[PDB]
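Posting here for the record, re: N~2~,N~2~-diethylquinazoline-2,4-diamine.
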Amino acid sequence: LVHVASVEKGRSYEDFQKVYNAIALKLREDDEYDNYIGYGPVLVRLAWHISGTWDKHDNTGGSYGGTYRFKKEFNDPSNAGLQNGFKFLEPIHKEFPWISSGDLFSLGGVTAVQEMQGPKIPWRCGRVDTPEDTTPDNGRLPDADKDAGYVRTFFQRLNMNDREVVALMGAHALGKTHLKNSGYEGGGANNVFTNEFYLNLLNEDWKLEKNDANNEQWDSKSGYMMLPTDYSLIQDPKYLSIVKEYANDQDKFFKDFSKAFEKLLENGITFPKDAPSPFIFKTLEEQGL
Ligand code: HEM
Ligand SMILES: CCN(CC)c1nc(N)c2ccccc2n1
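Prediction output follows.
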């Protein structure tokens, strides 16, 4: 099972930069979503969830096939809330129908991170929509009510190491949890990509308690929250070291996140040797737009 990258016929970097810019402009415009968080964080979560179904043991799942567009995956309970990102991207797809679904979903995440002032994330085209029977079954995305051992083991399936895991979890600087989606509770929210996840972990005073849905989470006096899997990153001694590093080095966190996130979005894809180099898209700000 090989998924070969195939460039959308006749398309080049400028075509994709146009897609990037349409997403970026809509992000800027549709500013009231989720109490003024905007759609950035849900697009990041979407890109992660379309990718996180991958299994290195058989090369099934991952971003390549655009299979989130199919009912079984769209309705995965782990994907609750992500319908909002799909709806956001729908008109973008209508504007640029030549882009594959996996390319759009993954590009949405890249665009969101960069527009939220995160690192540049190189991105490659050529994901190809595959048929409904290639849709992975539900249950491949991780549970939040678990400990460090679970996190470490889970991410081995995505070929992620301890540093990659801690870097990718820093995306939890973004957005918030919603009781109706996940059974987790928290009013704190943010739409600027920073290393604040690590700084909160280390600096807040956390108390484990049951929330209003009877699920355990870690809550601070300030009103912030951590999932059990978030908090595991300071419970485990190896994870803790890396949390400290990223709390103390914004640039290292940005570089490590960029590499891990591109890897996440590329897992399962075979790029021919004559494939284009990864594209680094300019932000709207860099374009004077
Ligand atoms: C152990 C791994 C992870 C677990 C258990 C987990 C769990 C969760 C949960 C329960 C939520 C709240 C969903 C909602 O209630 O709306 C959430 C939100 C989010 N997650 Fe994760 N996550 C994990 C890893 C990641 C990764 C690797 C990324 C991306 C690199 C990511 C990005 C996000 C973002 C940006 C949000 C906020 C979305 C919003 O505000 O709508 N997560 N995650
Ligand atoms: C770093 C604190 N925030 C954002 C204010 C936060 N913390 C989290 N632990 C978190 C977990 C899942 C989704 C969003 C999240 N956001």
